[PDB]
Amino acid sequence: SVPSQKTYQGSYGFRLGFLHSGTAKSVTCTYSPALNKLFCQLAKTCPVQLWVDSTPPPGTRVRAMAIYKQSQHMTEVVRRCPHHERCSDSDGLAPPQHLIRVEGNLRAEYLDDRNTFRHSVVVPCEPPEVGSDCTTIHYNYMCYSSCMGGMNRRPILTIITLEDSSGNLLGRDSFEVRVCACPGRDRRTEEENLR
């Protein structure tokens, strides 16, 4: 009924990494370590790094799924709102109902779970380019946290799972996400509230 969100590095020492983009009002995507929360604009590139201590087997994949953060909403499938699922902004691969898309990866697969009805996007786990120490996936969130009839101001978490070729768990990490008009200002505000 509810996907696990327990951090698990697993045998390969799997964990996420985020850039340090700052909080200028112009920033389009910014991550707060103190809040473990990514703030981003609608449909803008969200670079998420994948780090491992050892190389996982050929066929390993990386899946992203969103769930509501509040327990009383956790059984509800996170999906795009009645407006955005109908705006015909398809990239040719992602179903119009899916909140999370992967940018620039023709091998991305989108799943509508036949039992839970939850949405997810999965890609092959690739090694870093020569000269790099990690691999980066570029995600896009396709609705604002405030969209009526959809997330409707409810906070969500994105769960990233490292899986084997059968879909079995190898590792897991997660972070809260707020899709908003001014990520820099909102990150500053929430960090101040926390302080």
Annotated binding site for Zn(2+): 81, 84, 143, 147
CB of 50 to Zn ion, least distance (A): 28
Length of the chain: 195
Minimum CB distance to Zn ion smaller for 14 or for 144:
144
Minimum CB distance to Zn ion smaller for 150 or for 171:
150
Identify whether the C-beta of residue 162 lies closer than 8 Å to the C-beta of residue 56. Answer: yes
Please report, in range form, the residues annotated as the binding site: 81, 84, 143, 147
| Residue whose C-alpha is closest to residue 154's, from 128, 176, 131, 139 | 176
Minimum CB distance to Zn ion smaller for 28 or for 49:
28
Please state whether beta strands 100-102 and 37-40 pair in parallel, antiparallel, or not at all (unpaired): unpaired
Minimum CB distance to Zn ion smaller for 32 or for 145:
145
Number of other CB atoms surrounding residue 122 within 10 Å: 19
CB of 32 to Zn ion, least distance (A): 23
| Residue whose C-alpha is closest to residue 110's, from 136, 90, 87 | 90
Minimum CB distance to Zn ion smaller for 15 or for 98:
98
List residues near Zn ion by CB under 5 A: 81, 84, 143, 147, 150
Give the largest CA-CA distance in the chain: 45
Q: Give the C-alpha separation, 186 to 83, whole Å.
A: 24
**175: β partners:** 158
CB of 115 to Zn ion, least distance (A): 26
Identify whether the C-beta of residue 58 lies closer than 8 Å to the C-beta of residue 125. Answer: no
